[PDB]
Structure formats: C-alpha cells, structure tokens
A paper describes a structure:
LH2 complexes are oligomers of a basic α/β-apoprotein dimer, each of which binds noncovalently three molecules of bacteriochlorophyll a (BChl a) and one or two molecules of carotenoids. Light energy absorbed by LH2 is rapidly and efficiently transferred via LH1 to the reaction centers, where it is trapped in the primary charge separation reactions. Overall, the cryo-EM maps and the corresponding models of the four LH2 complexes are very similar, all with a ring-like structure in which nine α/β-heterodimers oligomerize to form a nonameric complex. The most unusual structural feature of these four LH2 complexes is the hitherto unknown γ-polypeptide, which partially encircles the LH2 complex toward its cytoplasmic side.
Only the pucBAc gene pair is unable to produce a functional LH complex, so we could purify four different LH2 complexes that will be referred as PucA-LH2, PucB-LH2, PucD-LH2, and PucE-LH2 from this point onward. The absorption spectra of the three other Rps. palustris LH2 complexes are essentially the same and have two strong near-IR absorption peaks at 804 and 856 nm, corresponding to the well-known B800 and B850 BChl a Qy bands. The B850 pairs in PucA-LH2, PucB-LH2, and PucE-LH2 from Rps. palustris have H-bond patterns similar to that in the LH2 from Rbl. acidophilus 10050. On the basis that the B800 Qy absorption band of PucA-LH2 (also, PucB-LH2 and PucE-LH2) is higher, relative to the B850 band, than that of a standard B800 to B850 LH2 complex, it is reasonable to propose that these γ-bound BChls increase the 800-nm absorption of the complex. We have confirmed this earlier finding by recording fluorescence excitation spectra of the PucE-LH2 complex, the high-light LH2 complex from wild-type Rps. palustris, and the LH2 from Rba. sphaeroides, which lacks a γ-subunit. The efficiency of energy transfer from B800 to B850 is high for all samples, so whether there are 15 B800 BChls as in the Rps. palustris LH2 samples or 9 B800 BChls as in the control, the γ-bound BChls are active in energy transfer and therefore, add to the LH capacity of the LH2 complexes.
Residue numbers in the entry:
A (entry chain S): 4 to 97
B (entry chain J), C (entry chain L), D (entry chain H), E (entry chain N), F (entry chain F), G (entry chain P), ...: 2 to 47
K (entry chain I), L (entry chain K), M (entry chain G), N (entry chain M), O (entry chain E), P (entry chain O), ...: 1 to 48
Amino acid sequence: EYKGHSGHPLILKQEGEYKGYSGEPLILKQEGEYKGYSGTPLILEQKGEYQSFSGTPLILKQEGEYRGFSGAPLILKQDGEYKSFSGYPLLLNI
Amino acid sequence: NKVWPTGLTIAESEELHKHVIDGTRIFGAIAIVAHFLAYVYSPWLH
Amino acid sequence: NKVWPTGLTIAESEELHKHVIDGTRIFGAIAIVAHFLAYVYSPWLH
Amino acid sequence: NKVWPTGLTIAESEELHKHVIDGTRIFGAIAIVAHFLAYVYSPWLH
Amino acid sequence: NKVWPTGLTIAESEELHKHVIDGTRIFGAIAIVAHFLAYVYSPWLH
Amino acid sequence: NKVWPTGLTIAESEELHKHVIDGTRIFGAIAIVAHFLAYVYSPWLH
Amino acid sequence: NKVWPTGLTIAESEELHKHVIDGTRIFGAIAIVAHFLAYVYSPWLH
Amino acid sequence: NKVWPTGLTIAESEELHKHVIDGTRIFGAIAIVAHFLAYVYSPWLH
Amino acid sequence: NKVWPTGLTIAESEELHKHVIDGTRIFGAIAIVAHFLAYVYSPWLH
Amino acid sequence: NKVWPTGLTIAESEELHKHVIDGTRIFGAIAIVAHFLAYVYSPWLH
Amino acid sequence: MNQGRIWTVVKPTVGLPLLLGSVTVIAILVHFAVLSNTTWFSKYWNGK
Amino acid sequence: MNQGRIWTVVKPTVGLPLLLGSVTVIAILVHFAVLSNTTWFSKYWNGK
Amino acid sequence: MNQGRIWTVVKPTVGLPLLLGSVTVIAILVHFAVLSNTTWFSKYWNGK
Amino acid sequence: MNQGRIWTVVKPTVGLPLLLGSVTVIAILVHFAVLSNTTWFSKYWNGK
Amino acid sequence: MNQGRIWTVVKPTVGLPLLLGSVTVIAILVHFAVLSNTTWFSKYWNGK
Amino acid sequence: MNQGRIWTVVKPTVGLPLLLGSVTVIAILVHFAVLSNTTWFSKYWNGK
Amino acid sequence: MNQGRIWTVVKPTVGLPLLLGSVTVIAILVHFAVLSNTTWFSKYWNGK
Amino acid sequence: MNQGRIWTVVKPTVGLPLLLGSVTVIAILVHFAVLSNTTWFSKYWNGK
Amino acid sequence: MNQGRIWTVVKPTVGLPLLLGSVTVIAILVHFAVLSNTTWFSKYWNGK
Ligand code: BCL
Ligand code: BCL
Ligand code: BCL
Ligand code: BCL
Ligand code: BCL
Ligand code: BCL
Ligand SMILES: CC(C)=CCC/C(C)=C/C=C/C(C)=C/C=C/C(C)=C/C=C/C=C(C)/C=C/C=C(C)/C=C/C=C(\C)CCCC(C)(C)O
Ligand SMILES: CC(C)=CCC/C(C)=C/C=C/C(C)=C/C=C/C(C)=C/C=C/C=C(C)/C=C/C=C(C)/C=C/C=C(\C)CCCC(C)(C)O
Ligand SMILES: CC(C)=CCC/C(C)=C/C=C/C(C)=C/C=C/C(C)=C/C=C/C=C(C)/C=C/C=C(C)/C=C/C=C(\C)CCCC(C)(C)O
Ligand SMILES: CC(C)=CCC/C(C)=C/C=C/C(C)=C/C=C/C(C)=C/C=C/C=C(C)/C=C/C=C(C)/C=C/C=C(\C)CCCC(C)(C)O
Ligand SMILES: CC(C)=CCC/C(C)=C/C=C/C(C)=C/C=C/C(C)=C/C=C/C=C(C)/C=C/C=C(C)/C=C/C=C(\C)CCCC(C)(C)O
C-alpha cells in the first residue's frame, strides 16, 4: 500500500454506485426510441434507392472502357520494356 | 441487416444520427438566441 | 461483384457517391444564393 | 447486453457519463464563482 | 496477373490512371479559360 | 475482478490514482510556496 | 530472386528506378527551358 | 512476479528508475554549477 | 548470419552503407565546388 | 541471455552504446576545435 | 436528415470527435476574428 | 458524376472527413482573406 | 444527461483526453485573449 | 501517360487524397501570393 | 478523489505522459505570459 | 543511375509520394523566395 | 523516488525519450527567453 | 566508415528518407539564412 | 558509459534517429540564435 506524504485520505471509494456531489439526477434514462427535444421528425427513412434532391440524373454509369471527356488516347501502352523518352542508358548495373 | 465496416448496422447508424441532428438543432436554437442578444447589445446591425 | 479493398462493391460505391454529388449540389445552391446576397449588399461588383 | 465496439456496455457507458456530467457541473459551479470574483475585482461590467 | 502490393492488378492500375489523366486534362481546360479571363480582366499582361 | 480494457483492475486503478493525487497535492503545496515568495518579492500585490 | 522487405525483387526495383530517373530527366529538361525563358525575360543576368 | 503491460517486472521497473533518479541528480549537480557561474559573471543578482 | 530486427544481415547492411558513404562523398565533392564558385563570384571571403 | 522488449540482448545493447559513446566523443572533439577557431577569429571572448 | 447511414462508413470514433471538435474550433476562430477586427468587442472586455 | 467508383479505392473513413473538412477549411480561409483585405467586411462587424 | 450512450461508440481512451485537454486549451486561449486585449489584466500582473 | 503502373506500387488510399489535396493547397497558396503582392486583386474585392 | 477508476478506461501509457507533459506546457505558457507582459520579471533577469 | 536497388529497402508507398511531394514543396519555396526578395516578380503580377 | 513503479504502466520506449527530449526543449526555451529579454546575454555574444 | 552495421538497428525505410530529407531541409534553411541576412544574394536575384 | 543497457528498453529505431536528429536541430537553433543576435556573424557572410 502507498503511504504518501500529503497526509490521508488519498482517495475516496464507493461501494455500490457513483454518488454525485452536484445533486441528483446525473443522467436521464432512455427506455426506447430516442425521445428528442427539438420536436419531430429527426430523420427521413430511406426505404429504397436514394430519393435525391437537386434533380436527376445524379450519377453517370460506366459500361465499359472509360470514355474520356478530354478525348483519346488516355494512356500509352507498354510492351516488353520501358520505352525511354530521354535516351539510353537509364540505369547502370553492377 | 449486416454490420458495415464501422460495426454498426443501418438501424444503429440511423438511431445515432437522431442524436447528431437533435444536437445540431439544439446548437442552432442557442446560437439564434445568442445572435439576438448580440444584436440588441452591440452596434452590429444597430 | 467482389468487395474491393475498401470493403465496398461497385454498386455500394455508386450509391455512396450519389450522396456526395447531391450534397455538392445543395452546397452549390446555397453558395450561389450567398453570392447573390453578397452582390446585392456589398460594393463587390459596384 | 453486448459489448459495443468500445468494449463498454450501455450501463458501463451510462455509469461513465455520470462522471463526465458531474465533472462538468463542478467545473460550471467554480466558473460561476470565478466570474463573480472577476466582476467584483475588475471593470468588466463595473 | 498477380495483385501487386497495393491490391490492384496492372490492368486495374491502368484503368485507374485513365481517370487521373482525364481529370488532369479537365483541370487544364478550366485553367486555360480562367487564365484567359484573368488576362482579359486584369493588368497582368495588359 | 476482471481486467478492464486498459489492462488494470479497479484496485490497480485506485492504487495508481493515489499516486496521481499525492503528486498533485505535493505539486500544489510547492506551487503555493512559490506564489508566496513571488508575493513577498514581486510587486504583484505589493 | 527473393522478395526484399519492401515486397519487390531487385529487377522490379531497377525497373522502378528507370521510371524515377526518366521522370527527373523530364523535369530537368523543362527546368532548363524555364530558366532560359527567365534569363531572356527577367533581369536575372540581363 | 508478473510482467506488467509494459513488459517489465516491478524489480526491473525499480532498477530502471534508479537510473532516472541518479541521472536527475547528475543533471541537478551540473545545473547548480551553471547557476553559480552565471551568478558570478552576470548581473543577475549582482 | 541472422536477420537483425531491420531485416538485414550484417553483410547486407555494410553493402548498403557503402552507398551512403559514397553518396555523402559525391554530395561533398559537389559542395566543395559550389563553395569555390561562391568564393570566386561573391564577396564572402573576397 | 534473453532478448529484451527492444529485441537486443544486454551484450548487443552495450556493444551498440560503445558507438554512441565514441560517436559523442568525436562530435565533442570536433566541437572543441570549432570553438577554438571561433575564439581566435571572432570577438566572442576577444 | 438523409445521411443517417454515414456512420455505417465513417467510424464514430473519428466522426464524432471531428464534428464536435471542428464546430468548436470554428467558434474559437469566429471569436478571434470579431475580437481582432472590432472596437466594441475589444472595449467590452476593457470595461467601464 | 462519373467518378463514383472512387470509393472502391479511397476508403470513405478518410475520404468523407477530408472532403467535408478541407471544404470547411477553404471556407474559413476565404472569409479570413476577404476580412483581412477589405474595408466593407471589417466595417460590417464594426457596425454603427 | 440525454447523451450518456456516446461512450458505447466514442472510445474513452480518446474522448476523455480530448474533452479534458480541449477544455483546458479553451481556457488558455480565453486567458491569452483577455490578456492581450485588456489594460487591467495586463496591469494586474504589473502591479503597483 | 507512361506511369499508369504507379498505382501498383503507390496505394490509391494515399495517392489520390494527396494528389487532390496538394493541388488544392497549391491553388490556395497561389491565390494568397497574388492577393498579397498585387493591388488590383485586393482592389477587385474592395470594389467601389 | 472519486475518479480513481479513470485508469480502467483511459490507458496510463497516454494519460500520464499527457498529464505530466501538459502541466509542464501550461507552466511554460504562464511564465512566457508574465515575462512578456511585465516589466519586473523582465527586469529581474536584466539585473543590476 | 547506381541506386536502382534503393526501392528494395525504401518502400515506394512512402518514397515516391515524398519524392514527388518534397520536390513540389521545394519549388513552391523557391517561388516564395524570389517573390519576396525581388521587385520585378512582384511588379510582373502588378502588371502595366 | 516513490514512483519507481511508474515504468510498469508508462512504457520506457515513450517515457525516456519524452523525458530526455522535453527537458532539452525546456533548456532551449529558457535560453531563448533569457536571450530575448536581456541586454547582457546578447552583448556576451556581440563581443568586444 | 565504421557505422556500416547501423542499418541492422536503424530501419532503412525511415533512416534513408530522414537522411536525404533532412539534408535537403538543412540546405533550404542555409539558403534562407544567407538570403535574409545578406545584401549581395538578395541583389543577385534583383538584377543589375 | 553506465547507461549502455538503455537500448534494452529504448529501441534504437527511434532512439538513434531522435538523437542524431535533435542534435542537428539543436545545432540549427544555436546557429540561428547567434546569427540573429550578433553583428559579426551577420557581417561574416556579407563579407567585402
Ligand atoms: C506539510 C505539507 C504537505 C502535507 C502534509 C500533511 C500532513 C503531515 C498531514 C496532512 C493531512 C491532510 N492532508 Mg496533506 N500535505 C500537503 C498537501 C495537501 C493538500 C494540498 C496542497 O492541496 C491537501 C488538500 C491536503 C490534504 C490533507 C487532508 C486530507 C488532511 C488534513 C486532515 C486534518 O487533520 O486536518 C486539519 C489540518 C491539519 C492538521 C494540517 C493541514 C495542512 C495543509 C493541508 C497543508 C497545505 C500546504 C501548505 C499551505 C504549504 C506547505 C508547503 C510545504 C511545507 C513545502 N494535503 C503537503 C504536501 N498533510 C493530515 C492527515 O492525514 O490527517 C488525518 C496529516 O497528518
Ligand atoms: C452548489 C454545489 C454543487 C451542486 C449541489 C447540489 C445540491 C446540494 C442539490 C443540487 C440539485 C440539483 N442540481 Mg446540482 N450542484 C452543482 C452544480 C449543478 C449545475 C451547474 C450548471 O453548476 C446544475 C445545472 C446542476 C443540476 C441540478 C439538478 C440535477 C438538481 C435539481 C435542481 C432543481 O430543480 O432542484 C430544486 C432546487 C433548486 C431550485 C435550487 C438548487 C440550487 C443548487 C443547490 C445549486 C445550483 C447551482 C447554483 C445556482 C450555481 C453555482 C453556485 C456557486 C457554486 C456558489 N447542479 C454544484 C457543483 N445540486 C438539487 C437536487 O438534487 O435536488 C433533488 C440539490 O438539492
Ligand atoms: C427549445 C425549442 C426546441 C424545439 C422544439 C420543438 C417543438 C416543441 C416542436 C418542434 C417541432 C419541429 N421542429 Mg424543433 N425545436 C428546436 C429546434 C429546431 C430547429 C432549429 C434549427 O433550431 C429546427 C429546424 C427544428 C425542426 C422542427 C420540425 C421538424 C418540426 C416542425 C416545426 C414547425 O414549424 O412546427 C410548428 C411550429 C412550432 C412548433 C413553433 C416552434 C418551431 C420552431 C422551428 C422552433 C424554433 C426555436 C428557436 C429558433 C429557438 C428558441 C430557443 C429558446 C431557448 C426558446 N427544431 C429547439 C431546440 N420543435 C414540432 C413538431 O414536432 O411538429 C410535428 C413541435 O411540436
Ligand atoms: C431548387 C434548387 C435545387 C435543384 C432542384 C432541381 C429541380 C427542381 C430539377 C433539377 C434538375 C436538374 N438538376 Mg438540380 N437543383 C439544384 C442544384 C443543381 C446544380 C448546382 C451546381 O447547383 C446542378 C448542376 C444540378 C443539376 C441538375 C440536372 C441533373 C437537372 C437538369 C438541369 C437543367 O438543365 O435544368 C434546366 C432547368 C429546369 C429543368 C428548371 C429549373 C430547375 C432547377 C432550378 C435547377 C436548374 C439548374 C441551376 C444550375 C440551379 C441553380 C439554383 C439556384 C442556386 C437557386 N442541380 C438545387 C439544389 N434540379 C431537373 C431534373 O432533374 O429534371 C428531371 C429539375 O427539374
Ligand atoms: C472541348 C475541350 C475538352 C477536350 C476535348 C477533345 C476533343 C473533342 C478531342 C480531343 C482530342 C485530344 N485531346 Mg482533349 N479536350 C480537352 C483537354 C485536353 C488537354 C488540356 C491540357 O486541356 C489536352 C493535352 C488534351 C489532349 C488531347 C489529345 C490526346 C487529343 C488530340 C489533340 C489534337 O491534336 O487534336 C487535333 C484535333 C482535332 C481532331 C479536332 C479539334 C480538337 C482540339 C485541337 C482540342 C484542343 C483542346 C485544347 C488543347 C485544350 C482546351 C482549351 C480550352 C477548352 C479553352 N485534351 C478538354 C477537356 N480533346 C482529339 C482527339 O481525340 O483526336 C484524335 C479530339 O477530337
Ligand atoms: C528533349 C530531348 C530529351 C532527350 C532525348 C535524347 C535523345 C534523342 C538521345 C538521348 C541520349 C542520351 N541522353 Mg537524353 N534527353 C533529354 C534529357 C536528358 C538529360 C537531362 C538532364 O535533361 C540527360 C543527362 C540525358 C542523358 C542522356 C545520355 C544518357 C545519352 C547521351 C550520352 C552521350 O553523350 O552520348 C554520346 C552523344 C550522342 C549520342 C549525341 C548527343 C546527345 C546529347 C548529349 C543529348 C543532350 C540532351 C539535352 C541536354 C536535353 C535538352 C533539354 C531541353 C530541350 C533544353 N538526357 C530530353 C528530355 N536523349 C542519346 C542516346 O540514347 O544515346 C544512346 C540520344 O541520342
Ligand atoms: C473566419 C471567419 C471570419 C468566419 C468563419 C465563417 C464560417 C466558415 C462559419 C462556419 C460555420 C459552420 C460550418 C457551422 C457548422 C455547425 C455545425 C455543423 C454544427 C453541428 C453541431 C453538432 C452537434 C451538437 C452534435 C452532437 C452530437 C451528439 C450529441 C452525438 C451523440 C451520439 C451518441 C449519444 C451515440 C449514440 C449511440 C447509440 C445510437 C448506440 O445509442
Ligand atoms: C485564399 C483565397 C484568397 C482564395 C481561395 C480560392 C479557392 C482555391 C477556392 C477553392 C474552392 C473549392 C476547391 C471548393 C470546393 C468545394 C467542394 C468540392 C465542395 C464539396 C462538398 C461536398 C459535400 C457537401 C459532401 C457531402 C457528402 C455526404 C453528405 C456524404 C454522405 C455519405 C453517406 C450518407 C454514406 C452512405 C453509405 C451507404 C451508401 C452504404 O448508404
Ligand atoms: C478565444 C475567445 C476570444 C473566445 C472563445 C470562446 C469560446 C469558444 C468558449 C467556449 C467554451 C466551451 C465550449 C466550454 C466548454 C466546457 C466544457 C464542455 C466543460 C467540460 C468539463 C468536463 C469535465 C470536467 C469532465 C470530467 C470527466 C471525468 C473526470 C471522467 C471520469 C471518468 C471515469 C472515472 C471513468 C469511469 C469508468 C467506469 C468505472 C464507469 O467504468
Ligand atoms: C528557398 C531557397 C532560397 C533556396 C532553396 C534551394 C534548394 C535547396 C533547391 C533544391 C532543389 C532540389 C534538391 C531539386 C531536386 C529535384 C529533383 C530531385 C527532382 C525529381 C523529380 C522526380 C520525379 C519527377 C519522379 C517521378 C517518378 C515517377 C513518375 C515514378 C513512377 C513510377 C511508376 C510508374 C511505378 C512503376 C512500377 C513498375 C516498376 C512495376 O513498373
Ligand atoms: C541556420 C544556419 C545559419 C546554419 C546551419 C549550419 C548547419 C547546422 C549545417 C549543418 C550541415 C550538415 C549537418 C550537413 C550534413 C550533410 C550530410 C551528412 C550529407 C549526407 C548525404 C548523404 C547522401 C547523399 C546519401 C545517399 C544515400 C543513398 C543514395 C543510398 C542508397 C541506398 C541504396 C541503393 C540501397 C542499397 C540496398 C542493397 C542493394 C545494398 O541491399
């Protein structure tokens, strides 16, 4: 057991439950659904697909290779080795 | 329904969001009162 | 389809992004009104 | 009941939140007195 | 082909980078217009 | 009793907190002396 | 050959560094031009 | 005795803290000399 | 020999450090020239 | 002897710290000469 | 009131601290802004 | 509006907080910018 | 007193340090604000 | 357009948020640069 | 004194370094505050 | 052109974002340096 | 000398670096404080 | 040339980025130092 | 030369980077201090 220098007690301890100093209650019970204070409703229940605001369409599907809006091509392919754009060699080796 | 990657179900998330909106409405209510006091007792619009 | 490394399928990802776009369109709508008010009541374009 | 993702039950969480509220009410009580002292010994409203 | 350490195959990486390049070219297009407007309506080169 | 999520029992937590309070009381006493010395030599209240 | 702690072979690392070096040579080439433009149009050495 | 969550026994912890105490004393001894030299050569109390 | 906690043998570590030595020597050899040019073309020692 | 929580033995730790000691001696030995040159060439004590 | 599923994909251990925190950081920044850029709020503390 | 696959590779736990955050940080910065560099916004708070 | 379930989803190992820490940081900031923007609190330390 | 393999070795969870983020930060900094170092941009906001 | 169960839910490996560290940081801040905003503490070092 | 094996021991998930990010940060700093320390770059934006 | 058991609940891998580090940070800050607020220390370097 | 074993106990995934990064950060700081505290380097950019 | 067991409880992967780094950060701060507070070092670079 710790003695301590600043006298005794060093702590308070309680048998069954926390007893507050700032009176009672310390908390409110909630038996069921959230009994909100700022009226109702508190949420809109989405049953199906997203019933968006701000009109429709809301996304554009992709059905294959990506159609770039800035034209084509979007990529340069690679085959067998890296084709340098600044001459050779690129690496030395041990 | 399934537990999503956060570990909540959809129903648990919707019950959680009831707190976030009720809290936000409480914060809005206090702030609107605070702005009314700040209007009456400052030159802001005055 | 498979779950990708984030744990979402493509269909779940698309249903998420619907919220991001609708959120941005609501943000954009409020911002346009805010700019109209800031035009009417400030020297910005006067 | 189940342990939620934090490892607390609802009862252990609510018993914990008693501490957070009691601490807040103690902090609020001291702050009300500290504002009264600052009102007496400063020109703030005076 | 194998999944590389990021969890994408090569073909999945190529399909991703097509988005990054297209997004960059859209950003470039908007920037050219924004600089042209700034050229017309500022003393920058003017 | 059970080990709680931190790896301490309730008894081990209370034994630890006796050190935290003893340290706080030692610090408070040492601080009170230094405020007295500051009051004696500085113009603070003087 | 063995995978090293980063998850790459030597040959995969060396192929990776071919990209890194080429990326610096492209950056270097653009920079030499941008300095020459600055020499022509700024007083830097002029 | 048991290894605690840090992986030290009480005896290993105490044998460690002897180094911290004796290290703090050597710091204190060296610092006191530096305050004395500073008092001799600076106008601090002088 | 064993892999040490970093995953390298002593021989692999010493082969790595040769790159760090020679990388430092290259950086030093460039820096001596950069200082010599600064001595010729600036009033530093001049 | 055992591997400690860092993964080193005591002997591996002490053979390491000989590098930290001798490294600090070399840093100190250079710093003395750097201070001597600063004393000779600057108004510091001079 | 549509986003109630967000906590299925944004973990409350980060979403709720960042929400409550940043709302407070905004309030701090607005107070510093009105304080630094007005006379009457600066005077209100100086009193009399 | 065609990028909605992005959440297959960017985790919403980082994506949405960084999105909602940095958009708010930009809004704060634009208010500070106009506040620091205009008379009319500063005067609007100063009132009278 | 209505929110006591929050610790089922916000981990105390972060939510309690951040609550106690930020409440302290707010107090530090209000002190530095009133110190920097008032005569009397500056004078109070300077004494006489 | 050569580097489409990069996401085999740079994880998009870090790659894309940094790419979108730092570009936005650079945009902010260039606005602050031109705002601080020009009369006309500041005068544009000040109006009149 | 009632709070001695806090270490059942806040890990000492973080709570103690943050408690000791932040107390030291608060001390440093109060010294820098009084040092910057008083003559006598500044003059106490300048000597004579 | 000797260091091609560095990515066997430095992980590209960190080393590439730091290489690209820091070179960008260095470039931003050199622009802010020349902007702050020259008349003409400040004048160039101010125009006329 | 009572706290010999602190390293049972604070890990030495953090506690010793934080101790040695922050002590050094405090020393730096105290030197900068005396340097910024005294003539004699500034003059001690300026020489003659 | 005696420390060749340091990478058995310092992990190259951090020690190589920290070495190369900080050596660059040092060079940035020395340039900003000589720039801010000399006429000739400030003038070198300004021309003439 | 008595502490050589510290690496049984502080991991070299953090202790050695923190040592070599902070020793350098200290050296930088000392140089900035002597630079900002002495004429002769400021003049040493200006040369002539
Ligand atoms: C000498 C200064 C020591 C100290 C030594 C002792 C001793 C010795 C005793 C206590 C005891 C007590 N201590 Mg202690 N204690 C100190 C700091 C504190 C502080 C604080 C600073 O906030 C508090 C709240 C307490 C709390 C308490 C009570 C629980 C209890 C008083 C019961 C009693 O009989 O009452 C009537 C009160 C008294 C007889 C004495 C009260 C002393 C007060 C609390 C000291 C305050 C500090 C003082 C202004 C500055 C001292 C500077 C130092 C000399 C450097 N200690 C410091 C570290 N404390 C007593 C106990 O356990 O009784 C059962 C006891 O025997
Ligand atoms: C004053 C010292 C303690 C305190 C001690 C008590 C005691 C003792 C009691 C309560 C009671 C109540 N307290 Mg408490 N309480 C404090 C702080 C607070 C604060 C706060 C923001 O500071 C709040 C909102 C509460 C909340 C409440 C309710 C849960 C409860 C019923 C009130 C009512 O309608 O009752 C009917 C009562 C009244 C109309 C008046 C009650 C006034 C209480 C005693 C003081 C309230 C704070 C005071 C106005 C401001 C601070 C004073 C300065 C510290 C000097 N406590 C502080 C920390 N509290 C009561 C209770 O549990 O009843 C069953 C009760 O008797
Ligand atoms: C302290 C008062 C409570 C409050 C108490 C109630 C009550 C009581 C009711 C609602 C109801 C409603 N509330 Mg509520 N509500 C508050 C805050 C809000 C805020 C907000 C941004 O602050 C919003 C958008 C809402 C939203 C709504 C709707 C979902 C619903 C219908 C409103 C209506 O026109 O009803 C018709 C008109 C009214 C009921 C009059 C008051 C409504 C307005 C919106 C409240 C404004 C409060 C004002 C800004 C702050 C005053 C604070 C002072 C401390 C008193 N609440 C605050 C926190 N709310 C109603 C409901 O459920 O209907 C089915 C209902 O009966
Ligand atoms: C009430 C304000 C709502 C809104 C409510 C609606 C409604 C209602 C409709 C759409 C429809 C559309 N919306 Mg919407 N929408 C808003 C904000 C946006 C924004 C944006 C950046 O702010 C965009 C890009 C879109 C996108 C679109 C398209 C997918 C679609 C056809 C547009 C068109 O050419 O309409 C041409 C014009 C019309 C059809 C009539 C006017 C409809 C409203 C006003 C939207 C016009 C677009 C314009 C940019 C909005 C500015 C609003 C002001 C800020 C107040 N919405 C806000 C949040 N939207 C339409 C749809 O889906 O049809 C099947 C539709 O009827
Ligand atoms: C409408 C503006 C669209 C756009 C729509 C198109 C269309 C439509 C086409 C391309 C095609 C091409 N685009 Mg694109 N593209 C844009 C932005 C870009 C940018 C950029 C930095 O902004 C780049 C580098 C590219 C790159 C390219 C090439 C890969 C390709 C062949 C160009 C050529 O010589 O065509 C030679 C010319 C033609 C066939 C017809 C005219 C097309 C002109 C030359 C497009 C010029 C765009 C200009 C560089 C950037 C935008 C200016 C602003 C809108 C003000 N796009 C934006 C987002 N792009 C073309 C293609 O696939 O060719 C096989 C094509 O037809
Ligand atoms: C816009 C031009 C391209 C470019 C296109 C080419 C081409 C085309 C070739 C090389 C080849 C070479 N390139 Mg390259 N290269 C560029 C950028 C660089 C840079 C750099 C820092 O910018 C460097 C160091 C290199 C390095 C090299 C060498 C490995 C090699 C010539 C060795 C030699 O002397 O052979 C002996 C000499 C020769 C064969 C002929 C002269 C080659 C000269 C020296 C290349 C000079 C490039 C010049 C500095 C770039 C100007 C950039 C701006 C447009 C101003 N390249 C840029 C991005 N490179 C060569 C090769 O692959 O050889 C097998 C080759 O033919
Ligand atoms: C700089 C200048 C000059 C100017 C700056 C101008 C400027 C930009 C201003 C911007 C302002 C903005 C943007 C303001 C935004 C304000 C907002 C968004 C407020 C939100 C408040 C939210 C609250 C109060 C949340 C409470 C949550 C709560 C209580 C949650 C409780 C959860 C529980 C109990 C768990 C339940 C678990 C189980 C279900 C299992 O039971
Ligand atoms: C400095 C100066 C002078 C000037 C600076 C100038 C300058 C640079 C300005 C720059 C400005 C910029 C760039 C502005 C950009 C603005 C943007 C992009 C706004 C975006 C808003 C996004 C929103 C609102 C998103 C809401 C998401 C939402 C609601 C998501 C909900 C998700 C859910 C519910 C999960 C569902 C899960 C399941 C599917 C399973 O159900
Ligand atoms: C800058 C300018 C000019 C202006 C700025 C203006 C401005 C914005 C001001 C803003 C001010 C604000 C917002 C103030 C907010 C103050 C608040 C919210 C105070 C809260 C205090 C909370 C406390 C004290 C909590 C103690 C918790 C405790 C002790 C918890 C103990 C837990 C235990 C024991 C575990 C049990 C485990 C088990 C055994 C059950 O299992
Ligand atoms: C402030 C003042 C006054 C003064 C300060 C002065 C000062 C200090 C200045 C310092 C300046 C310095 C130091 C400048 C240094 C510049 C450097 C070094 C630039 C480097 C650029 C590198 C690039 C562009 C790399 C691209 C890599 C790339 C794209 C890599 C792609 C990889 C892929 C596709 C994966 C392949 C996967 C598989 C192998 C399977 O195929
Ligand atoms: C503020 C004022 C006024 C003044 C401030 C004054 C002040 C304080 C100045 C201080 C200056 C200092 C301290 C400067 C220090 C500079 C130093 C130390 C430079 C070091 C450079 C090191 C380099 C370049 C390393 C390259 C490594 C490399 C390339 C490594 C390659 C590795 C590979 C390939 C892996 C192999 C794996 C395998 C296959 C073997 O398994």
